[PDB]
Structure formats: C-alpha cells, structure tokens
Amino acid sequence: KVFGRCELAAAMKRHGLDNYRGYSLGNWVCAAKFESNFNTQATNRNTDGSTDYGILQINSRWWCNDGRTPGSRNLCNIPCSALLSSDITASVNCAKKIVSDGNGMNAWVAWRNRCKGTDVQAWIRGC
C-alpha cells in the first residue's frame, strides 16, 4: 500500500511516533517519504546482498532476518516480511528500537539527507 502523506501521518501519530524520543512527527513522515515513497512494499536489494524492506526501508544484515542475508544480526528479532505489511505496526515497532538504541534518526540515510535541518513540520501541516 502506498499511503497518502496525511494518511501516513495519522497512522504514525496513532502509533505513538509524535515527539517519540523528541522527534516531532514530521520527521517520521519525511523519512518515510524519501525512504520508500510511502510504499509499504518497497524492497531495495543492496550490493552486499542485503535488502531494505518496507515503508522505512529497514535493512536485513542488522534489523530483520530475511533468510538470504549472511550474518543477519536481526536486531529487531523479526522477519523482514513482517515489514511489507499495510499495517505499519511492525515497522513502527522496529523503528522505535533503532531510534531508542541511541542511533537517532540518523539511522535513516534518507532522513539525514533530505530532512535533517529542514522544516519537517511542513510534512504534517494541513492534515
């Protein structure tokens, strides 16, 4: 499912992402936009064999186990397939661990590149 901006914002809000660890919700909507374009099914295979899954493009050598990635640390103790669901709960649940583990939102390359130090609330205004 390809969420709508304001649709994803509402779903993330309900899933407790607003001001999570202090990150206003616009951070989460912008990350999701430049990570997966709001497509909960997006997968991107990487040069090291690993693949990025879901709406927040979570990676298989460290966060989830997809079965075809050598050395998967699987830090989220979850299959990668649980992140391609239209129900962002697993993704949101894992995104919290990444963030609460001290990585910050820097863990998302797209956020650090297209959102950090930008007017992120632009991403939720009008919903």
Epitope: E35, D48, Q57, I58, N59, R61, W63, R73, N106, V109
Partner: nanobody
Framework: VQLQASGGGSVQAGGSLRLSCAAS????????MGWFRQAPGKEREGVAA????????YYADSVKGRFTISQDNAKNTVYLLMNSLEPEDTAIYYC??????????????????????????WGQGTQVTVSS
C-alpha cells in the same frame, strides 16, 4: 569503545606496509571502519573504508589500486595493505569507526569522502614514513 592501530613505521619508496585496527568495547558494530591520513601540510585525506560485515570497500582516488582494506572480524579488526608506497604517502594514519547501526543501507565511503562524517570513534595516529 577502543580503537587500537598497529603497523606503520618506515620503508623505502616502492615497499609495502600493513596497518591494523581492532575496535574493542563494542556490543554492536561498528557499522564502518576506515582510515584517514594527515600528510604534513596537507588536508586530512579519507583513504579507505569497509562496511563491517557486508564487506563493501571504498578507496580514495589517490590510493586506488595500491591499497586494500579487509577485515578479520573477531574484535572488529581490519587491515590496510599498502603496496607501491611512494613518499607522497608519508603521513599520520588514523583509524576510525562509525558506531551508528543504520536502519537503511549506508555506504561507508560516503562519510569518508565527505570530511569523515559519521566516523565518531577515532584511534591513535600511526606515522608512516616512506624513504628515498
């Protein structure tokens, strides 16, 4: 966390040297380990990086073809084999790690080529001097 480099010294132009770096005190990671060098009177240069585990490598255009970075795993140990050493390679070599466990795929040579962004943990420098 600790980073302990080894190797370095002096050698004649044309010879080779092998540096090493073991990250210690890590529970998870590092995501990246690489090498930087501060030649006398020049800008700090990002030399080579490797994506821990995944194993992808990146090299500065100067050292491309001559250096080779690899990992022994274990205590997050990596090596830089330096062949065809020229006196221009004389500099202080620093080991560096990026402790962030990225959510999405991050290519380590990204922070290396752009000022060492992301490489938070640094080690002691090791002088390498190429004679002749």
């Amino acid at each position: 966390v600790q980073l302990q480099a080894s190797g370095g010294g002096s050698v004649q132009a044309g010879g080779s040297l092998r540096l090493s770096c073991a990250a210690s005190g890590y529970t998870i990671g590092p995501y990246c380990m690489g090498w930087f060098r501060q030649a006398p009177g020049k800008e700090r240069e990002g030399v080579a990086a490797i994506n821990m585990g995944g194993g992808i490598t990146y090299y500065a255009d100067s050292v491309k073809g001559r250096f080779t970075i690899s990992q022994d795993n274990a205590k997050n140990t990596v090596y830089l084999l330096m062949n065809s050493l020229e006196p221009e390679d004389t500099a202080i070599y620093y080991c560096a790690a990026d402790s962030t466990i990225y959510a999405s795929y991050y290519e380590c040579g990204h922070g290396l080529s752009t000022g060492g962004y992301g490489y938070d943990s640094w080690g002691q420098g090791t002088q390498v001097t190429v004679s002749s």
